[PDB]
Design a binder for this molecule. Structure first.
Ligand SMILES: *[C@@H]1O[C@H](CO)[C@@H](O[C@@H]2O[C@H](CO)[C@@H](O[C@@H]3O[C@H](CO[C@H]4O[C@H](CO)[C@@H](O)[C@H](O)[C@@H]4O)[C@@H](O)[C@H](O[C@H]4O[C@H](CO)[C@@H](O)[C@H](O)[C@@H]4O)[C@@H]3O)[C@H](O)[C@H]2NC(C)=O)[C@H](O)[C@H]1NC(C)=O
Ligand SMILES: *[C@@H]1O[C@H](CO)[C@@H](O[C@@H]2O[C@H](CO)[C@@H](O[C@@H]3O[C@H](CO)[C@@H](O)[C@H](O[C@H]4O[C@H](CO)[C@@H](O)[C@H](O)[C@@H]4O)[C@@H]3O)[C@H](O)[C@H]2NC(C)=O)[C@H](O)[C@H]1NC(C)=O
Ligand SMILES: *[C@@H]1O[C@H](CO)[C@@H](O[C@@H]2O[C@H](CO)[C@@H](O[C@@H]3O[C@H](CO[C@H]4O[C@H](CO)[C@@H](O)[C@H](O)[C@@H]4O)[C@@H](O)[C@H](O)[C@@H]3O)[C@H](O)[C@H]2NC(C)=O)[C@H](O)[C@H]1NC(C)=O
Ligand SMILES: *[C@@H]1O[C@H](CO)[C@@H](O[C@@H]2O[C@H](CO)[C@@H](O[C@@H]3O[C@H](CO)[C@@H](O)[C@H](O)[C@@H]3O)[C@H](O)[C@H]2NC(C)=O)[C@H](O)[C@H]1NC(C)=O
Ligand SMILES: *[C@@H]1O[C@H](CO)[C@@H](O[C@@H]2O[C@H](CO)[C@@H](O[C@@H]3O[C@H](CO)[C@@H](O)[C@H](O)[C@@H]3O)[C@H](O)[C@H]2NC(C)=O)[C@H](O)[C@H]1NC(C)=O
Ligand SMILES: *[C@@H]1O[C@H](CO)[C@@H](O[C@@H]2O[C@H](CO)[C@@H](O[C@@H]3O[C@H](CO)[C@@H](O)[C@H](O)[C@@H]3O)[C@H](O)[C@H]2NC(C)=O)[C@H](O)[C@H]1NC(C)=O
Ligand SMILES: *[C@@H]1O[C@H](CO)[C@@H](O[C@@H]2O[C@H](CO)[C@@H](O[C@@H]3O[C@H](CO)[C@@H](O)[C@H](O)[C@@H]3O)[C@H](O)[C@H]2NC(C)=O)[C@H](O)[C@H]1NC(C)=O
Ligand SMILES: *[C@@H]1O[C@H](CO)[C@@H](O[C@@H]2O[C@H](CO)[C@@H](O[C@@H]3O[C@H](CO)[C@@H](O)[C@H](O)[C@@H]3O)[C@H](O)[C@H]2NC(C)=O)[C@H](O)[C@H]1NC(C)=O
Ligand SMILES: *[C@@H]1O[C@H](CO)[C@@H](O[C@@H]2O[C@H](CO)[C@@H](O)[C@H](O)[C@H]2NC(C)=O)[C@H](O)[C@H]1NC(C)=O
Ligand SMILES: *[C@@H]1O[C@H](CO)[C@@H](O[C@@H]2O[C@H](CO)[C@@H](O)[C@H](O)[C@H]2NC(C)=O)[C@H](O)[C@H]1NC(C)=O
Ligand SMILES: *[C@@H]1O[C@H](CO)[C@@H](O)[C@H](O)[C@H]1NC(C)=O
Ligand SMILES: *[C@@H]1O[C@H](CO)[C@@H](O)[C@H](O)[C@H]1NC(C)=O
Ligand SMILES: *[C@@H]1O[C@H](CO)[C@@H](O)[C@H](O)[C@H]1NC(C)=O
Lengths: 598, 582, 50
């Protein structure tokens, strides 16, 4: 369906006008469905904009401002959903599109297919050379009129004698089609003729070819496999014949305005829908490898707000005023973003720079559900020792195609992400880190969940330069690489380990403490038993049950330093197993027989 | 209001003397009949004015064996046909013969499913004047129609005021109004010959205008006057933030309408609908006082104790010696109970012995029934229903012949018992032909019922004069003579104190009997070690810590039977003190 | 060009070397002109070449 994302710049631009045109091409060329905004600003009058003809729908707003071109080639644009509005008011805004000191500017709109706007108003203002913005019945296009919708040029002429008088241009091929204000009284939606029989389906937005939920030009609410519907088919159907709720077949999962058979692995399954986070009345659980959510019991784990979610919905970066919200957090529900205005302060506002000591609050975070976006870091922090216990990131929200993004940090020489084990979805982008040494050693397919994931590495410190005249991975470290220097920064090791540190051998028969190898990670056995001499094994496994020799007496299967006497009494030998006492012992016990009660 | 229907088909009334009272209580003052509308075996001159309110029937309409000249259903607009008579017909008029003269169904414009069956009605004129194809629905044109021409009355000519001679009766007001066959478009229903007379796709039974608020009847769901295809969901999915969120406009689905909360006996389900049964892997939870909802099992669900009409017992006639053991240890039964002849007698064809009084004791633990309780036979050695004395609630979600939740027919009972019973959730109570039953007239039945359309119907029980002639009356120690039976245990509400489930005048504080301390309506014994002095505190309280005097081994902070083995021993005054050796 | 330079009290609006401009008339609204390395509505973050 050729989906692309909006720019979110508003009126601001690059200072070089040719690069502003080239960026517009890179964002929207060959795209059909725009998520976010369609924003066209400061384009020169000689530039070719015919690449915009493929656009069919815009989810946010359409903004056209300060341009010098004559014509908008948006002949296929049908619907503007308006789920974000310009200045929180306008879904379509067109203004100031002419040169103050010349004859250049916007002359015709070309918007013949534009049939509805679901939310917000229309703003047309000060377009000195624009014809046919007026004479358009904008109340047919806007779904919720407010008798917003401001319209305000001469010498444009009558459209054509054969036209109804509502028109986008200078000929009869540009006449506006009315679809809602010229209808039979019985209709809820829009029409394909003036008769009660040429009325179309209530769930279809911006016009129809026929009366069915298959026969629609664009859909509002959900697209169920080519039919447009109020909600996806559910796991149960109500039976008003019997007052019972009956199990249903063909039930589909709701996912981002589509109905699907399988919910993607990044999202939580809840009541036949895929969600980024579960509501506060319930708890997120995993069963059979599937993420899902069930009612909360006792005290449930809670995730903290990320940048762009919850109480931080308005935040652009971690900064000196919002960083305190992360002090006791173990999971972030949203993105974690570090921009220049957050790290070094924002003098236009009251927010000062972050003291590097404050960043230590993120040492308790194990999961980030959105992407990690690092574009600024304090001048002399040489690594990411903050996040050393971070386990997994991303896959529910991405920045473009990325879950991990590190741009242009010159003070950093190593990463040191000790605990990072998996990235559930999205790509990795690490560039321009001219002093970063270890990056070239990492085997990144061990962190990815699928064969569809990729990593972009370029323009960092040369791998041959740092290898020859710089730092390398520890001698115990495997071919999968290391995050930084030493025995505790390696992704996976040869020999053995204890905690985060890789080692040659595990003190099974030699040392002030004694262990059992237990596969790759070595563990201590119960200290109440003996530590063996002459190179002999101390324990066969964990617990007092697995000791090879005992320095004290015993009970049952194991070595025992103290037996539970005085409970009831129980007798113990100094060098043999403990014995049950004779009945009716009241002061102490010397054994299991009649004279042993003290 | 909304009322339910009988589903008796053509069977004889259980109590012919009270059949008109059953029909008046079920149908008086309601607009919508859920289930069937069944009017059968009515006597000559029966007063039927209470039927004039009905506009909608959700099942079929059955009119059979009646001796009335007319049935006042002229306001009826739509029959939905969600159940059909003999699996084929939505409207059936049978054997009404001195019999029905006219149908008079002036407002009827929709039959959504099934046919029309009219047979053996000698006096019934105007059966073959009606254009039945205008009444059947466009998408459900089964049209199975049987009409009987064998009329004994001479028909009066159809009024000249009726353009098509389509009379339902002799009056100028009896002319059929056509809503399908008179329009040139594809419109399911319309109000005139013009294209502008066509009305909204969701309207049924005709229209007063082109909008979805102009319907005479609603095809799918009536949203508080606005006619709609689905009830608004309680939870809505945000297409852009990928999260479920509450809907401030959301409604529960209930039958063919949308509501903000469901009626008293219905079980609320979290998907946005109200049901008589809970979905698989869910529990019933009384989350708030006076209501109930389904909640999901977080771990594998506990055993559910089923009764008659559900699961493996859904085809079973009655409780018998072959299946009674399945109720062992049950406090709540999901289903109904029925005790019939051949429950308390044998069946040589089923190799099954009769139930004994010692086997009925399996129900001693029972506190709640989800369906109905029907008893038409009972052992002659049991004077009451005391085997059900702990029964608190009969919900009535399933009713005997669609009408009765509590039924007692022809039994040897002297008094009802059932003293724990607090609620009859739904349905009528029917008690008749019990020649020895006395205390049915002293039970506070208006306290057990929970809405309109509920009543006690009774006949042929022991006359009140024969109860008084033998001194059979409520005990004096309880409110206003409200009793379930004779003696101090069968009182509803004691005026003083309750001891061992008996009402009593005195709370044993100063009496020669083993002494008891006072509570709000109850009396409880002193600890035996405490001295029974004449002071109101000295012996008295729920722990020895309240006692002031002690018979022996007195530990200064409280009275005990023996000094505890720090060890203690009794001193020269009989009080406990620490031992020199522990 | 329908734009003027913003006042010294508000020139801090643009970050990362961006220049601050105001629209000639009304409420009023502002824009930044970014260097070729930065984007966003007031030059908050980097341009990516992919
Ligand atoms: C994360 O959020 C918590 C709130 O949940 C914030 O608050 C507490 O912070 C302290 C210090 O960091 C945490 O650790 C403990 O601090 C105690 C300080 O003394 C105060 O608290 C005790 C509470 O009983 C009072 O008696 C006392 O008068 C003071 O008011 C120490 O007492 C604790 O250790 C010592 O005492 C215990 C006593 O059992 C001994 O076992 C120890 O050996 C030792 O001698 C301990 O250091 C504390 O847990 C937090 N409390 C809560 C409610 O959880 C954090 O500041 C906040 N920030 C982060 C990220 O830490
Ligand atoms: C923008 O407005 C245009 C009108 O200016 C609007 O119309 C589309 O026009 C194209 C042709 O330019 C139609 O093309 C279809 O292409 C297929 C495949 O080649 C053909 O099979 C179709 O033609 C036949 O079959 C149709 C079956 O329904 C018949 O209706 C038709 O008479 C032919 O026999 C057809 O040419 C295209 O179908 C229309 N659009 C629609 C919705 O019909 C276009 O919709 C507007 N832009 C957008 C993106 O909505
Ligand atoms: C002492 O050291 C032992 C190794 O030398 C430790 O290992 C063994 O641990 C198990 C318990 O985990 C003991 O009990 C047995 O448990 C298995 C469990 O079955 C499941 O796991 C195995 C793989 O481990 C898998 O093959 C199965 O399909 C199951 O999924 C049971 O099958 C047995 O019946 C039994 O209960 C072992 O006895 C024990 N090993 C030995 C040699 O005893 C042991 O835990 C250490 N500590 C102690 C207290 O013994
Ligand atoms: C409801 O969803 C269905 C998909 O489930 C939509 O149909 C799809 O429409 C897209 C539109 O881009 C089609 O992709 C296009 O295919 C043509 C093939 O010639 C190609 O030239 C375009 O570049 C583009 O890739 C896609 O094939 C089509 N899928 C199917 C199964 O027909 C449909 O439009 C949705 N309806 C509404 C009203 O939203
Ligand atoms: C980077 O890590 C990936 C895993 O994420 C490594 O891929 C693995 O490659 C080995 C062989 O080196 C595969 O094992 C076996 O290889 C033999 C041939 O030597 C073959 O006959 C067996 O059928 C089997 O494939 C292993 O399955 C494969 N894993 C995956 C998930 O594809 C890769 O080698 C690592 N690179 C380095 C140099 O660290
Ligand atoms: C010694 O090493 C063995 C492996 O060679 C360890 O046994 C494994 O222990 C892990 C937990 O550390 C078990 O996995 C987890 O089990 C939970 C059960 O609820 C499950 O939710 C997790 O997804 C995960 O599967 C693993 O099952 C177990 N393996 C076997 C065969 O039992 C053992 O823990 C080590 N002992 C010591 C002292 O460290
Ligand atoms: C949809 O359901 C609503 C109720 O939720 C129905 O509205 C009810 O309309 C009837 C008349 O058809 C009203 O009864 C009349 O009330 C007046 C009150 O002055 C009285 O004078 C009349 O004798 C008669 O009793 C009834 O009050 C009204 N209920 C409410 C709550 O407004 C409506 O008819 C249903 N629509 C369809 C198409 O079935
Ligand atoms: C029937 O049951 C009710 C409880 O449902 C019994 O409790 C209540 O008893 C009091 C006293 O007889 C009734 O009157 C009020 O008593 C308080 C006592 O402090 C007094 O302050 C008030 O001025 C008033 O006299 C009360 O109404 C009653 N409860 C209810 C809900 O009616 C009642 O004793 C039982 N009746 C018999 C005769 O068993
Ligand atoms: C109306 O009465 C006629 C008789 O007057 C019935 O018609 C008879 O039906 C039987 C059925 O076995 C045939 O054998 C006869 O030949 C029929 N007689 C005539 C005169 O046609 C008819 O069934 C009656 N209709 C109803 C609805 O009862
Ligand atoms: C509680 O009161 C009873 C009387 O109701 C007391 O018992 C009486 O004790 C006197 C002692 O001289 C005897 O003469 C009476 O014959 C007793 N009467 C009865 C009914 O037995 C008893 O002593 C009182 N107890 C206390 C703690 O004072
Ligand atoms: C390093 O950063 C700290 C932050 O407190 C600062 O005080 C110090 O002057 C910096 N030193 C250098 C050499 O960058
Ligand atoms: C290796 O990198 C260091 C970084 O300081 C640089 O001085 C040196 O010239 C580099 N050597 C080569 C061969 O590029
Ligand atoms: C019906 O009432 C009429 C008087 O209106 C009377 O003549 C007739 O006997 C009554 N029929 C019966 C069976 O009560």
């Amino acid at each position: 369906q050729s989906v692309c994302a909006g720019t979110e710049n508003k009126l601001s631009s690059l200072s070089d006008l040719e690069q502003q045109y080239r960026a517009l091409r890179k964002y929207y060329e060959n795209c059909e469905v725009v998520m976010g905004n369609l924003e066209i600003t400061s384009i020169e009058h000689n530039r070719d904009l015919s690449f915009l003809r493929s656009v069919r729908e815009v989810t946010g707003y359409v903004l056209v401002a300060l341009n010098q071109f004559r014509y908008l080639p948006l002949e296929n644009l049908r619907i503007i959903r308006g789920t974000k509005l310009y200045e929180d008011r306008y879904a379509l805004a067109i203004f100031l599109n002419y040169r103050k000191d010349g004859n250049f500017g916007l002359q015709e709109l070309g918007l013949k297919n534009l049939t509805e706007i679901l939310n917000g108003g229309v703003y047309v203002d000060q377009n000195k050379f624009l014809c046919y913005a007026d004479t358009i019945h904008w109340q047919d296009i806007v779904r919720n009129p407010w008798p917003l919708t401001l319209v305000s040029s001469s010498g444009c002429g009558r459209c054509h004698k054969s036209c109804t008088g509502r028109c986008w241009g200078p000929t009869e091929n540009h006449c506006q089609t009315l679809t809602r204000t010229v209808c039979a009284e019985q209709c809820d939606g829009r029409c394909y003729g003036p008769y009660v029989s040429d009325c179309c389906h209530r769930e279809c937005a911006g016009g129809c070819s026929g009366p069915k939920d298959t026969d629609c030009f664009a859909c509002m609410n959900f697209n169920d496999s080519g039919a447009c519907v109020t909600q996806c088919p559910q796991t149960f159907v109500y039976n008003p014949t019997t007052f019972q709720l009956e199990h249903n077949f063909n039930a589909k999962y709701t996912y981002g305005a589509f109905c699907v058979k399988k919910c993607p692995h990044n999202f939580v399954v809840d009541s036949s829908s895929c969600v980024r986070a579960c509501p506060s009345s319930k708890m997120e659980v995993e069963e059979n490898g599937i993420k899902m959510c069930k009612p909360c019991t006792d005290i449930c784990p809670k995730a903290c707000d990320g940048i762009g979610t919850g109480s931080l919905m308005s935040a652009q970066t971690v900064d000196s005023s919002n960083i305190d919200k992360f002090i006791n957090c173990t999971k972030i529900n949203g993105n974690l973003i570090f921009l220049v205005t957050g790290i070094h302060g924002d003098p236009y506002n009251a927010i000062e720079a972050i003291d590097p000591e404050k960043l230590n609050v993120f040492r308790t975070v194990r999961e980030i559900t959105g992407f990690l976006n690092i574009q600024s870091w304090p001048p002399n922090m040489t690594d990411f020792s903050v996040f050393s216990n971070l386990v997994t990131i991303g896959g529910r929200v991405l920045y473009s195609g990325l879950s991990l993004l590190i741009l242009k940090q010159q003070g950093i020489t190593s990463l040191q992400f000790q605990s990072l084990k998996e990235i559930s979805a999205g790509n990795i982008y690490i560039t321009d880190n001219s002093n970063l040494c270890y990056y070239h050693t990492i085997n990144w397919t061990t962190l990815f969940s699928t064969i569809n994931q990729r990593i972009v590495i370029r323009d960092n410190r040369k791998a041959e330069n740092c290898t020859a005249e710089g730092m390398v991975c520890n001698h115990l470290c495997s071919s999968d690489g290391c995050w930084g220097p030493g025995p505790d920064q390696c992704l996976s090791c040869r020999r053995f380990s204890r905690g985060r540190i890789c080692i040659e051998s595990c003190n099974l028969y030699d040392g002030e403490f004694r262990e059992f190898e237990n596969g790759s990670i070595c563990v201590e056995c119960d200290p109440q038993c003996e530590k063996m001499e002459d190179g002999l094994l101390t324990c066969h496994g964990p617990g007092p049950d697995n000791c090879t020799k005992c320095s004290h007496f015993k009970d049952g299967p194991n070595c025992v330093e103290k037996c539970p006497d005085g409970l009831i009494f129980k007798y113990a030998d100094p060098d043999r197993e403990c014995h049950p006492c004779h009945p009716n012992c009241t002061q102490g016990c010397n054994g299991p027989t009649s004279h042993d009660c003290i | 209001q909304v009322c339910t229907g009988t589903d008796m088909k053509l069977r004889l009334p259980a109590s012919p003397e009270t059949h008109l009272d059953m029909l008046r209580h079920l149908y008086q003052g309601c607009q919508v009949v859920q289930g069937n509308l069944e009017l059968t075996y009515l006597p000559t001159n029966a007063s039927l004015s209470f039927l004039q309110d009905i506009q909608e029937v959700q099942g079929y309409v059955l009119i059979a064996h009646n001796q009335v000249r007319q049935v006042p259903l002229q306001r009826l607009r739509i029959v939905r046909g969600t159940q059909l008579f003999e699996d084929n017909y939505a409207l059936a008029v049978l054997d009404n013969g001195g019999g029905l003269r006219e149908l008079q169904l002036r407002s009827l414009t929709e039959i959504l499913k099934g046919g029309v069956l009219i047979q053996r009605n000698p006096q019934l004129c105007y059966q073959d004047t009606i254009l039945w194809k205008d009444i059947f629905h466009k998408n459900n044109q089964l049209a199975l129609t049987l009409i009987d021409t064998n009329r004994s009355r001479a028909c009066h000519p159809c009024s000249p005021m009726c353009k098509g001679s389509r009379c339902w009766g002799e009056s100028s007001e009896d002319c059929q109004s056509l809503t399908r066959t008179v329009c040139a478009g594809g419109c399911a229903r319309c109000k005139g010959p013009l294209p502008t007379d066509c009305c909204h796709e969701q309207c049924a039974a005709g229209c007063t205008g082109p909008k979805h608020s102009d319907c005479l009847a609603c095809l799918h769901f009536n949203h508080s006057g606005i006619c709609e295809l689905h009830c608004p969901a309680l939870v809505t999915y945000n297409t852009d933030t990928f999260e479920s969120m509450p809907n401030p406009e959301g409604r529960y689905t209930f039958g063919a309408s949308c509501v903000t909360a469901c009626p008293y006996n219905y079980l609320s389900t979290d998907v946005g609908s109200c049901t008589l049964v809970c979905p698989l892997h869910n529990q019933e939870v009384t989350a708030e006082d006076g209501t109930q909802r389904c909640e999901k099992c977080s771990k594998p669900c506990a055993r559910v104790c089923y009764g008659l009409g559900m699961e493996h017992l859904r085809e079973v006639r009655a409780v018998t010696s072959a299946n009674i053991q399945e109720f062992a240890g049950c406090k709540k039964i999901f289903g109904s109970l029925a005790f019939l002849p051949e429950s308390f007698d044998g069946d040589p064809a089923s190799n099954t012995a009769p139930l004994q009084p010692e086997q009925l004791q399996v129900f001693e633990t029972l506190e709640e029934i989800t369906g109905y309780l029907y008893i038409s036979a009972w052992p002659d050695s049991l004077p009451d229903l005391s085997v059900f004395q702990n029964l608190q609630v009969i919900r009535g979600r399933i009713l005997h012949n669609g009408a009765y939740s509590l039924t007692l027919q022809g039994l040897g009972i002297s008094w009802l018992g059932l003293r724990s019973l607090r609620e009859l959730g739904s349905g009528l109570a029917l008690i008749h032909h019990n020649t020895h039953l006395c205390f049915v007239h002293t039970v506070p039945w208006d306290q057990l019922f929970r809405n309109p359309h509920q009543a006690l119907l009774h006949t042929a029980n022991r006359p009140e004069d024969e109860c008084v002639g033998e001194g059979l009356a409520c005990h004096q120690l309880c409110a206003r003579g409200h009793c379930w039976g004779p003696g101090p245990t069968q009182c509803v509400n004691c005026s003083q104190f309750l001891r061992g489930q008996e009402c009593v005048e005195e709370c044993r504080v100063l009496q020669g009997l083993p002494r008891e301390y006072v509570n709000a309506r109850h009396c409880l014994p002193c600890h035996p070690e405490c001295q029974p002095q004449n002071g109101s505190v000295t012996c008295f309280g729920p722990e020895a810590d309240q006692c002031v005097a002690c018979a022996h081994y007195k530990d200064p902070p409280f009275c005990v039977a023996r000094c505890p083995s720090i060890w203690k021993f009794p001193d020269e005054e009989g009080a406990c003190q620490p031992c020199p050796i522990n | 060009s329908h734009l003027v330079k913003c006042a010294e009290k508000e020139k801090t609006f643009c970050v990362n070397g961006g220049e601050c401009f105001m629209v000639k008339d009304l409420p009023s609204r502002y824009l930044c002109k970014c260097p070729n390395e930065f984007t966003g509505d007031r030059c908050q973050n980097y341009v990516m070449a992919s």
